[PDB]
Amino acid sequence: ENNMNEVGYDDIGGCRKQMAQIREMVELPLRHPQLFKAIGIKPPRGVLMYGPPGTGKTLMARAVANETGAFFFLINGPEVMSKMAGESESNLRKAFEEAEKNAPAIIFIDEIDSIAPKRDKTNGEVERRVVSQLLTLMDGMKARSNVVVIAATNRPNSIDPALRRFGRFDREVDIGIPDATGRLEVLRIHTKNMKLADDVDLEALAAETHGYVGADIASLCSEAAMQQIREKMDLIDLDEDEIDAEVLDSLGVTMDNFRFALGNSNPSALRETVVESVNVTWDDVGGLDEIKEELKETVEYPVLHPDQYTKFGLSPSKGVLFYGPPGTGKTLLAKAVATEVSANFISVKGPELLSMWYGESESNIRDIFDKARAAAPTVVFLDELDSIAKARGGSLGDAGGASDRVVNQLLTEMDGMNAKKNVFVIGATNRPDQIDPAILRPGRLDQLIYVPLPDENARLSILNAQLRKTPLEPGLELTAIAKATQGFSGADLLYIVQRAAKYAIKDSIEAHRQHEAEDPVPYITKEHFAEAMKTAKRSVSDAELRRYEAYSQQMKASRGQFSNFNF
Amino acid sequence: NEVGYDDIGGCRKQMAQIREMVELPLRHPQLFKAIGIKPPRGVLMYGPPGTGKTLMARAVANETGAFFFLINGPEVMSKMAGESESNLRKAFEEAEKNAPAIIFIDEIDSIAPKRDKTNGEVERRVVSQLLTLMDGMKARSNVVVIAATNRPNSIDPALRRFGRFDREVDIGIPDATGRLEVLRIHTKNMKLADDVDLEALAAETHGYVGADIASLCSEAAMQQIREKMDLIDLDEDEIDAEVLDSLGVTMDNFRFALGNSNPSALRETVVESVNVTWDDVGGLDEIKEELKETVEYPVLHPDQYTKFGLSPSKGVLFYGPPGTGKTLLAKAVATEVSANFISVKGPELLSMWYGESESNIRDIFDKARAAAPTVVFLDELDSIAKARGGSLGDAGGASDRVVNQLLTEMDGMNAKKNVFVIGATNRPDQIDPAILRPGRLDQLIYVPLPDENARLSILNAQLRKTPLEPGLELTAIAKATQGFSGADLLYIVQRAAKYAIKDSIEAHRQHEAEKEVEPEVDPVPYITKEHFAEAMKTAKRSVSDAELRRYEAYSQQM
Amino acid sequence: NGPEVMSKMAGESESNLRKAFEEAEKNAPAIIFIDEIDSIAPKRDKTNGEVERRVVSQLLTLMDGMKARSNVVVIAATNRPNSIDPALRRFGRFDREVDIGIPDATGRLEVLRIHTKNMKLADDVDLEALAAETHGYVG
């Protein structure tokens, strides 16, 4: 039943404004012509559809074709051209004449980018003839007779400017990323035919989905269904002959399938730059309670609690910069944020983004930040900012100030002609004095969090976090280790634990060797720690510590002229 | 259908010239013989798209009863053994044999590319055949050819030589008055409300040319139709009559239309509308008045300089320490100046290919000059204008050629088609001395660190859309916050808002927790004194003292 | 030949390669010798020219696919082996990268003996001394 599969205006959703604009533009000049003679002016007869892929442009066109009772003719982009000299223009002429004569009709030009690039960047011949013929067909003598032209593109900036003038393409509709309500609506339309268990909650699914657009939602649904099929095809055999009727019914793709598929899938934009999901949890990061709570506090509310921000009418805080001696756990905190927080993560290294060609670094940065704001809300981690943020003008001899142009590009991109809806930059630098002065400014990276060397209770917390899975001796107490280590870092405690594990594995494999010659060790013993902390050192010396404390106290001195401040 | 001289608007001088050229050698050949001059044979038309050139050609075709023959550039070629030559020959044969007709070829650039630039053999044949027939059509054969090209530089000069195409007509773009008559022409066939005053509408329509006015009118009509359709419950099955005579487009429709439209030239580089108003930038009032006066005076009071016979200053450069509303001022002018606005980020123009960069700079400056007046915002000038030096780290002086091209294409500014260059740099020392010329970025504005009253203005203007306590005084913070930049105050206020949100959500889920086992949704509907105290306990300074010292020295230089 | 195959026109270099391979397999069990592949198969990562990417992809496809080869062998020669995509340098495309270094003094003796096998000469001259003093020469 092709009628059942036919997609009406009900199918398309999440873009009701553009739907209304296109629906009126197509029907009102073909439903109330007397009204349009009464108003005095004629309606527009050219529209340009543009937006990222997987938003519903072709679906919108299909809905228009199904609903409107007028003739509908479709032209794919590259289809017109042919090897023999001068047939493409013949194709356009025959298409237009047949479309116009055979009742009032709707033209749709799919992927116009293949036809009209710029009229001056191309170097062929036939293409310039096709664009000139198209211009003539759009406007001239008897330009159009009760016909309107729709075009679809993903990169409207590669279009001839002559096409974007009134008379050729009058109105440009922007079908962008759906909102939370929009994604909820698309989820509802795409899940109206499959069988759901009562437990499913589409509102939560729309809540944790942050950048999925259209086909992304469809993919999520499809993969979830496939997972349910791979959950109920495990109890039943292959049964190549046929499927029994008791199992085909009562399938019921439950909510955990949706949770699993959402935890696996990523937005269609981000899959190019997807990073492996390193497994970390908040209990893994010991100590630094105020830092973790502050991070969670500033990241989870603007994305989940926008009503209060609208109520107060202030934008949220965007930037954050960790700085301190190496190994204190800033990168570890970044790992925790990347793995647990619901917002999207873009992990980029410091000098990874540079490039050989001229200006391509700036293009790469523009691409990354445009990608980040496209699938917003997103959090971007800039590790080792001192690689990218150099003090401008210090390098007389350089590659043409490429570093200077890079840092200036970053400055303008993080604060410029941008709506700045939801972008969170995290900074992590082990040399925070060499960073550019403007980057530390509020409004770009306002929160400078110092991660000092852990205290004894913080070293104890770190140790408890680092042994949360290893089997341990019942009579073993970490309090002595904490009381004995003072200047160590988290990496140093990890080193001590690894050494203890090394001695434990050595004893285990030796004992197994004698056993086979003719599980002795159930867990790590006291003596493995007694012999594992004799090769312990302090990672950061007193010079680096004195530098970082001098920096912190210089900031605290800059914190002057503060008091009780009674109101 | 029925288009005549009444339809055409603007370009009266060009209209008179074309009228003479097309009527006199066709209705009075005897007078041409009597005076003793052979009438011209060919006229080309060029200019930006949508300037009514094709409309004018149709009006000339209709008004004059002479036989007409339309040919379109890309429509003369064929497949059967190069029948394009035969096509043009038969076109000329029909044009001569039928009557003393008139021949009009549109978009000649499609059928006349430069010889070296086009590679192939059929193109050579068609261009040469066009040349020979255009030569052979003698003067006494009473026919004239009208050429209409969107781009004049796409034709080889051989077609432009005297005796084949001698008369040029630069239609260009209309002035404010031309826009006024174009509006009047377009609106003389619809029901206009009484309150419409087209003079104002032409005072604010700036970059619109020829056809964009029609788009504005039609879309405004649409706005009225939708405003009146939903209220009347116009069912898809029914037809309304009593509403029909009452539909009238109001002024608010046109305000909406102007706020939501864009000149077609600027359609590529349109930026999404971000609201900023002159009341949000509390401080720097003297800069606000100076900028508004200097940018508006050439646009509203031209006569003063004409009587003085002087060229008012055009360029200006903002410099100062980070975060003092420079980009905010750019946004404010972009929103509330009543002129076009094109901002470009520094590094966008550079590229790896050879030459395209400067070509893009030419494209942006051509676009800026075409839809004049405009305001070009150069943010982060520390990326383009760099001390050349003998460092030799450039890629064959690629930065050097780019900056030199920018200097050559920005220094050739004319008093006509005024384009105002806005500069904005963080570190003023690394810009080249060539940017301080009187004819190039003359004005040097310094954005200083704010004072106590300026800081109070910053706070009160920044929290306008913010619920507050009734009994709260902001003088204390001003007295305390001394070297604090505006961005730092934004940090303070955002932190206070964050603490308010923390308290609100805490009370919320608390009350809910006792609920499960309407009232005031927010027991803290506004920030409070202790929230501000706790936000201010952890505040920091933005700019250090070394930057202040070096900027003070730089200011002290002049 | 190395640079002969590449053509500015679209879809000709790969056309030449396809024609060569099909005729080679058609006629009889034969040996191909693509000399200076480095001018035909540069690093896909570091290249910008579309035609080189096209030719290297075509070579990869034809050399290995669905029933790619049937009793045919191919030989490659380069002056440097590093500037080639790794996908060519695995088993099934170029199995073993055999080296051929500068000839030894012994090799000088054999090459001189080969050269002088048909040229009449004085008896006094000795080949071993000539080879010893000809150090550094090649082929």
Binding site: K83, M84, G124, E127 | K79, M80, A81, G393, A398 | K8
Partner: peptide, 22 residues
């Protein structure tokens, strides 16, 4: 009949170098 043909040959790119001021 006489056929047409499309052709796109090449372009020119720009590299960037680093220097040391010893």
């Amino acid at each position: 009949a006489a056929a047409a043909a499309a052709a796109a040959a090449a372009a020119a790119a720009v590299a960037v170098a680093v220097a040391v001021a010893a």
